[PDB]
Ligand binder design. Sequence first.
Ligand SMILES: O=C(O)C(=O)Cc1c[nH]c2ccccc12
Ligand SMILES: O=C(O)C(=O)Cc1c[nH]c2ccccc12
Lengths: 387, 387
Amino acid sequence: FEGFRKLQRADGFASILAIGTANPPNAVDQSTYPDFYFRITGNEHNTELKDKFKRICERSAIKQRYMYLTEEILKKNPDVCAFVEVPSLDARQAMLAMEVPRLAKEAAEKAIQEWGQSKSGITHLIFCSTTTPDLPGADFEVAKLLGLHPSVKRVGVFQHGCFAGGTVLRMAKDLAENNRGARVLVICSETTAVTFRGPSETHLDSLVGQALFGDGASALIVGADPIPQVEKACFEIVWTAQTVVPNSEGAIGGKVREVGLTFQLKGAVPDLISANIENCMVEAFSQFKISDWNKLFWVVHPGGRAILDRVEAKLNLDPTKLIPTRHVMSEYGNMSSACVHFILDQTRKASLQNGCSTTGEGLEMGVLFGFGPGLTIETVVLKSVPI
Amino acid sequence: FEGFRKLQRADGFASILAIGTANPPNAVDQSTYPDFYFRITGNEHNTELKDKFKRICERSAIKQRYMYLTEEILKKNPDVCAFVEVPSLDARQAMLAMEVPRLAKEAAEKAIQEWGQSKSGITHLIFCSTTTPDLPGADFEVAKLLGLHPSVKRVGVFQHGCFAGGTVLRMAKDLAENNRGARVLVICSETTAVTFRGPSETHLDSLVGQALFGDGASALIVGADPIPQVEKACFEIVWTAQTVVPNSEGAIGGKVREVGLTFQLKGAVPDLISANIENCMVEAFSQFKISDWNKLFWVVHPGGRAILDRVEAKLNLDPTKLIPTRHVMSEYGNMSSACVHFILDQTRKASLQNGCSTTGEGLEMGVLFGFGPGLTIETVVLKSVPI
Ligand SMILES: O=C(O)C(=O)Cc1c[nH]c2ccccc12
Ligand SMILES: O=C(O)C(=O)Cc1c[nH]c2ccccc12
C-alpha cells in the first residue's frame, strides 16, 4: 500500500490550465438603472428613496452589469418585484433551475475549448452557486448538460457566498494534487434572480445589493503535472487559508425564506476587512520571505468600491495593483464567487498583451482574496507562469 | 517550491481516528407511529391511506427512530403538519437553524473526546446536512458552538443528500492526505424537521419517506500519519469513486420550496441500485485482486429494507455481512448521510468486543456505499486496523 499511496497522488502544484467566463446577454447600464429599477418595481413616485439609490449607484464604480432578469421577465413575475409583502421563492427556484446551469455550461464549454482536451478526461467537478433549488444540486445538472462521464466525482458548494471563488480554488488544490492525472472542472455560477427584489426604506442594505450584484459564471480546469507542450498553465495554487473575523457574523448574511433569498450588509464591512487583511498577508507570505506587498500581483473580490479603497490604503498598494480588479467590477459588478476568476482571466490576458514576463504582470507571486458571510476571508497564494 | 510541496503534504493514508454520534432525545416507536402520524396530521378518516402506511411501517425493518419533532412542537406548528395547503418553510428554517448545529455539536464533542487531543489541533471542518437555512451555512455555526479556531478551513456540503456520508469521506481523504498535520472534523447532521409533513393520496411517492426518515448526527476525526501510541486509527480511506446510474434522475429527489423540502422516492430504486452495484465492486476491487465479495466487511447506506435485500441477493453476500447495517436501520431508521458513519462505529466496536483480529470483523478490506439523488452511488474502499 505504501507504493499505492505514492502512485495514487499527483507530483507537482495544482495549476489552472484554462479559464472561461460567461454572462447573460443583457447589459444593464448603471447610469440609467435607478429610473428603470424604480419604474419596474412600481416605486416611481418615491423620489427620496430613488435618490438614495441614485447616490449608491453613482458611487459604486460599476458602469454596467449583465442580468438574466429583463423587463419582460419581471413583468411576468410581479412577485419578484415586491419587497417581502408576498412570497416569491418558488418562482425564483424555477428561474435558478434553468439559468444557473445554463451560464455554468457556457463558461465551462469555453474553458474546455481553451484546455483543448476531450471532456472524457475530466475526473472531478467542483460547482458553486449561492443557492441551488433541488436535490440533485446544480452540480448534477451541469455535468449532465456538459455530457460528462457518469463517473465524474462531484462536489457542490452552496450557500457559502461571495468568498467561494477562493473556496473552490482551495478545494481544487487538494483534489488535483492528491490524485494523479486528475483534471478538475471548477465552476462558479451566480445570478440575481435569487436576490432581486423591490426597494424598502427600512432595509437600505438590501438597496445597496440591488445596485452592486450582477450575473456571471466562471469555469476553470485545474490539474497538477500539466502535459508538456499539450496543456498550458497560467497560475499555480501554492497555499491557501480561510479565517473568520471575530464578532462580525451579522456583517454579511443571507436567509433562504418564502420570499426568496434576503440579505443584510453592514457599513462596517470595509473597516472589518481592512483591519484584518495585513495579518492574512503576513501569515501567507512570511514563509516566502516576502514583506513588500507591491512585489505581488493582486486579485481581490470586488465586494464594493469602499472595500477596495480601504484595502489599497491600508496596505499601501500602488495605484496599479487593483487595476484588473476594478476593471472587472466596472464591467460586471459584483458577481459573487465568480468575480475573482474573471479578474484572474483579465490579469493573464493583460500580461500577455502588454508583453509581460509572466502571467502575473511580470511578477512571480500573487494573492487572491475572497470575502463574504462570516465575515469570512479566503486567502489564496498564487504563482504566475513565465511567458 | 519542490521541497515545499513535499513538506506541505502528508505521508500516509487518511485515517479515521475517532467516531462520535448523537440523536434527539425523543425515541419514536415504529409500532405505534401510524396511529400517531395520522392523528397529528388529521388524516384519521383516510382509512385506505392509513392502511397502506401501516403496512409500510410494519415491513420497514425499523423498530424506532429519534425525532426532534415531538407532539408538543408539532402542536405549536400546525403548518408543518399539513401537506402543501399552506407555507411552512420559514418555520422549518427556524427549527433547522437550532437543531442541526445542536446535534452536530453533540456528536462532535464525543468524537473529540475519543480522539483525546486538543480541538486547537483541528485544521479543517467538512460539514454536511440535507439543507441549511442561511448564509453563513451551518458549518459556521457549528464551528462557533465548538469553539474552533477562526482559521479552521470549512467546507459545507448541502443538498447532496443520502449519499453524502460517502461524499464527506471522499473529501476528507484528499484534505487529510494533501496537508501535513491536518486533522479534519467531519460532521453529518440530519433532522426530519425539514421533511416531515402530512400524507397524501396524490403523492404516494412521498409516503414511504415518512416511515423511514429519522434524525441523527455523526462526527469523525480524519487525519493522515497518526501519532504512535497517542492517536488510534480504526480505518484507512484507501480509494473512492462516485457514479450516476443511467436515466434515473427522478428516482430519488427533493425540492426546496415554500412548503418546505418535498421529496420523492420511486419504487424502482432497489432494482436500479442492485443492477449497478456489481460494476461498482469490480471497478473498486479488481486493482486489489479481490473478486470474492464475502472476503470484505460491509457498510451500506440503509435507504430501505428492499435495497439491502436486493444488494445482498445480487452479490450473494453471506447473512452476516449486512448485520451492522441492518442493526443501525433497526435502531435509528434512515438518518440520511449520517447512517454509514453510525454503521462504521458499530462495526469497529463489535469487532473489538467479539474478539476479531481487525476493526473490520477480522477482515482486511471493506466497502462503504452511499446512495442518493442522481441516482448517485458513492463507493469508498476501506482498510481495517489490526486489533
Ligand atoms: O460581496 C459580498 O461579500 C457579498 O456577500 C454580497 C452578496 C452577493 N450575493 C449575496 C447573497 C446573499 C448575501 C450576500 C450576497
Ligand atoms: O435514502 C435515500 O436515498 C434518500 O435520499 C432519502 C432522503 C432522506 N432525506 C431526504 C430529503 C430529500 C430527498 C431524499 C431524502
